[PDB]
Amino acid sequence: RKYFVAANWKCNGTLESIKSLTNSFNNLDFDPSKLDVVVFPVSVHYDHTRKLLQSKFSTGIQNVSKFGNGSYVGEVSAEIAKDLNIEYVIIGHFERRKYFHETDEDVREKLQASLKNNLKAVVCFGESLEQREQNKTIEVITKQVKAFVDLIDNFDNVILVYEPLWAIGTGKTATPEQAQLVHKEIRKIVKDTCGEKQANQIRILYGGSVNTENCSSLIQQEDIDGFLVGNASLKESFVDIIKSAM
């Protein structure tokens, strides 16, 4: 299996800052047959960003509709994405769950729509501080993974992300050991549900706070296969995070 490092730009960017960033990213010589690197711009920046990135980079969108084509103002169907050859989607990011009411039922339906339309999916989950303090880390992640995991067909084409919500905006910091222990448990869930071969094929990314300070200690953990990176991916120095995985 390949390392997978993803830039989640969230709701950030200008036309000119993207020109500069993409140029910086293009200057990194890496081997895309070894390493998957994926950039997730804002929807209205996707075309702009794709045209600026060399083919060694994959691209995707940050969210996708559970509905197909039709009378759904504001939504981008998986069918539309397919017609544009958008390669990846993010599903279940904690911000969609938090601010926009996204449920486990929505995650499932979105994954089903995406795979049906040959989109590859980066699917996010993870537990809160209150949950982790009640020793519910495994309970919660098990429940969240089992909402969708039976849909996975090609285990190269769904990528899991662990988001330690307990260490996001709480004042707590996840250690690499603590991230590793969770990732090993995620892998065990996949092994038990889908198989040994499948569990050894699937990528499980760390999607907590990732930056130039901590990327090395995380990426070298046995069951951490890369990152879904937030604000550090809006920087030229994101190339060093890519390097950590090379």
Token pair listed for 240: 């060093």
Do the beta carbons of residue 121 and residue 157 sit within 8 Å? yes
Length of the chain: 246
Nearest partner of 5 among 210, 221, 236, 213, judged by Cα = 210
List 29, 55, 73, 153, residue binding its own copies (CB under 8 A):
73
CA atoms of 113 and 116, how far apart (whole Å): 5
Copy the structure tokens of residue 84.
Answer: 């544009």
Q: What is the DSSP letter of 131?
A: H
169 is in an annotated binding site: yes
Closest CB 15 distance from its own copies, rounded Å: 6
| CA neighbor of 51 nearest in space, from 79, 88, 23 | 23
Of 95, 127, 163, 185, the catalytic one is: 163
Asked if residue 43 binds its own copies (CB under 8 A), the reply is yes
**Do the Cβ atoms of 162 and 182 come closer than 8 Å?**
yes
Task: Choose among its own copies, Na ion, none what residue 77 binds, the Cβ cut-off being 5 to 8 Å by kind.
Answer: its own copies
Which of Na ion, its own copies, none does 246 bind, CB closer than 5 to 8 A by kind? none
Would you count residue 61 as binding its own copies (CB under 8 A)? yes
Please state whether 76 falls in left (phi above 0), alpha (psi between -120 and 50) or beta. Answer: beta
Catalytic, 93? Answer: yes
- Choice among 45, 93, 102, 127 that is catalytic: 93
Pick one of 11, 135, 153, 171: the residue that binds its own copies (CB under 8 A). Answer: 11
Told to judge if 163 belongs to the known catalytic residues of this protein, a careful annotator would answer yes
Contact residues: its own copies, CB under 8 A = 8, 10-15, 42-48, 61-63, 65, 67-77, 80-81, 83-84, 86, 90, 93, 95-96, 99-101, 230-231
Active site residues: 93, 163
List binding-site positions for D-glyceraldehyde 3-phosphate: 8, 10, 169, 228, 230-231
List binding-site positions: 8, 10, 169, 228, 230-231
